[PDB]
Each structure stands twice: as C-alpha cells, then as structure tokens.
Curated annotation (Swiss-Prot):
Family membership noted in the UniProt record: Belongs to the CEF1 family.
Protein name: Pre-mRNA-splicing factor CEF1
Described purpose of this protein according to its UniProt entry: Involved in pre-mRNA splicing and cell cycle control. Required for the binding of the NTC complex (or PRP19-associated complex) components to the spliceosome to mediate conformational rearrangement or to stabilize the structure of the spliceosome after U4 snRNA dissociation, which leads to spliceosome maturation. Its absence leads to an arrest of the cell cycle, possibly due to the inefficient splicing of TUB1.
General remark: Present with 784 molecules/cell in log phase SD medium.
Subcellular location per the Swiss-Prot or TrEMBL entry: Cytoplasm; Nucleus
Organism of origin: Saccharomyces cerevisiae (strain ATCC 204508 / S288c)
Length: 49
RNA sequence: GUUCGCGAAGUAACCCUUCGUGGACAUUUGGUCAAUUUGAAACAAUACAGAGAUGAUCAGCAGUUCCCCUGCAUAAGGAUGAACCGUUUUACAAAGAGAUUU
C-alpha cells in the first residue's frame, strides 16, 4: 500500500518545481489581488476615496 | 589710455605744461547648465523564503524578450543572469437517419 501510493504520487508529478512554484506564485497574486479589492470595497462602502 | 595733425591759454616765450578739437590704434564674452526637498540613481534597513530537469543532489550551453547588470570586450560572469509553465472554441464542412413548424 505504501509503495503503490508513493508510486501513484510520483506518476502525478507532471509539472516541475519551477512550474509548481509559479502556480504557487500566481495563486498568491490572485489571493493578494482579491484581498486588495476586498479592502478597497470596505473603504469604498466606508467613503474613504 | 598711446600716438598723429590743429587751435586756444600760461605767454609780445618755436622751451615746457594745460585746455579744447579731428583722425588712427582697441570693437559685441558667457550660458543645452540657477544655489538642499517637488523632474525622479540604486543599494542598504525589516520580515520571510532560499535554485532547472524529478525520488534526491547538481555541471551546463543555448533560444524569445517592448528585462537588464558587472565587465575594456564580439570573451566571461551574473541561479542554466531574471520572466518562459499562464489561459486555451469559428480559414468548420459533407453525407445519412429520425422527431418537429407549414
């Protein structure tokens, strides 16, 4: 079970670690961007332009 | 200011000096530029991570670029110098069959 599960973990390893960290970084860009828009929508319902 | 020419005074003085006059010598610099923020250097300070193939640890050389840096450089180095991976629909048809409006 352990060896078969590790084998089907490694056969999924399609993207490289630079592509993995780029998917990670683009996810962080979308999360920071939606947090920035969240903060702006709060300050815009507040009135602070 | 220097010189050349002339006149007038000292002065009935061809010496000298003064005053006045005409000429000549000499003729248009420098600034794309103003002396602390507000016409733009970048590093460093904080905090976190901490490298391209994949199971790990790595040598690289390249390519694209509306990214450059260090380099005297057409050498070399900068993590293989860095970003590359992300979305992803129509030069769009033809034949055949049934179920529908008239």
């Amino acid at each position: 079970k352990e060896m078969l599960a590790e084998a089907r973990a490694r056969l999924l390893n399609t993207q490289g670690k630079k592509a993995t960290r780029k998917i990670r970084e683009r996810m962080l860009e979308e999360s920071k961007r939606i947090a920035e828009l969240q903060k702006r929508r709060e300050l815009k319902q507040a009135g602070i332009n």
